């Protein structure tokens, strides 16, 4: 049930809050049971210093929040 | 028995304290054995900077307290 | 044996010390093998800023000490 | 073999060092495989602010050292 | 699926963000289920003090992000 | 193979570095698979405030380094 | 595959980065699946205060990086 939110966000642009002052935005291309994700066209925001990635692998362990697009 | 409190809070508005100066309020739409939750119409409060989400996935690992709505 | 202390505290008012400058007092309504608890009429004390809850779910992982009421 | 030390200290007054500036002294009434303990007539020392408990449950995870009384 | 990104990066030059102010760049020679990696011709950047290694073993546990080379 | 060093140190005086500014010296009387030890005639050094114990139980989880006596 | 690097470093002089400002250099005499190592003629560097050991046991849990000698 709770993971349904991540699953319905496949190919949508998600917001991800990681542990310790880091955030991401990107298109969810893939995820797994551990909450590992691959984000496409991703922006990383340390707070502000930004960084952009064509493809980004995010380690599940460090994910705190995931929000789908308003849509 | 203790998880009964989370279970009876399905569709109620819960308060959630996370690790490290973060709090949430939202409608509990879903949870699992790991204490992962989906919160609807959720407010995040870092302390104070606020943020609002239509739908929010919260990682169970970071949950310290959950309080149901009063009455 | 050691968990007997928590068990005999069912419905008594317990003191709970959590990781990192947080404490609780409340009536133990429920607990489980992970040391998750539901505390009734609970006070949370960060040190001092206080907060009160009619019903509180506490995540076992963060519990360091539990003391039953005196006598 | 190493746990024998804790076992032989049953009913003796043990010193316990916990993670992060905390110490205990008390009569070992019970312990388990996780190193959870119940300490009787226990003194807690944060360093110095002291606190006393008639009975105290200590979570095993946070125990770093245990010393038995000097015979 | 998400690990596919690491797998398709075999022999490419990857960027790796580790916990706590450390980054790496190097040629991915090997990885495993734990996300342990061996990086060839690797640069380590603490932030800035740099360090270079002909071959580097990175512990999986400390990996937060992995980004494959562009284009 | 690596644990052989701990095993050959039985009854020798070992140095032990724990997490977070703590060190021990003592006679290794016992150890287990978790790296729990009992140290005899042990000195604990926080850095410098020292403390001495006739018998000391050390929790394996917090052990970083173990050095056997020279020769 | 990734552990091959550690394995091929048997009897070579390796550099090891541990968690939290600590480094080691020594001759790799032994290692195991957990990444526990015994380092011979080892130097420990906290950053700078140095320390030397004839034989050193290193707990695998705290190892972040391992680099074999050049060529």
Numbering used by the authors:
A (entry chain E), B (entry chain F), C (entry chain A), D (entry chain G), E (entry chain B), F (entry chain D), ...: 9 to 55, 70 to 93
What do the authors say?
Sm and Sm-like (Lsm) proteins have been found in all three kingdoms of life: bacteria, archaea and eukaryotes. They are essential parts of ribonucleoprotein (RNP) complexes and are actively involved in various steps of RNA metabolism including pre-mRNA splicing, mRNA degradation, telomere replication, histone formation and translational control. Members of this protein family are characterized by two closely spaced, conserved Sm motifs 1 and 2, which adopt a conserved Sm fold that consists of an N-terminal α helix followed by a twisted five-stranded β sheet. A common characteristic of Sm/Lsm proteins is their tendency to form a hepta- or hexameric ring structure.
Structure determination of SpLsm2/3 was attempted at a resolution of 2.7 Å. One possibility is that SpLsm2 was lost during crystallization as the crystals were obtained from the heavily precipitated mother liquor. The structure of SpLsm3 was solved by single-wavelength anomalous dispersion (SAD) phasing method using a SeMet-substituted crystal. Residues 1–8 in the N-terminal and residues 56–69 in the loop region are disordered in the electron density map.
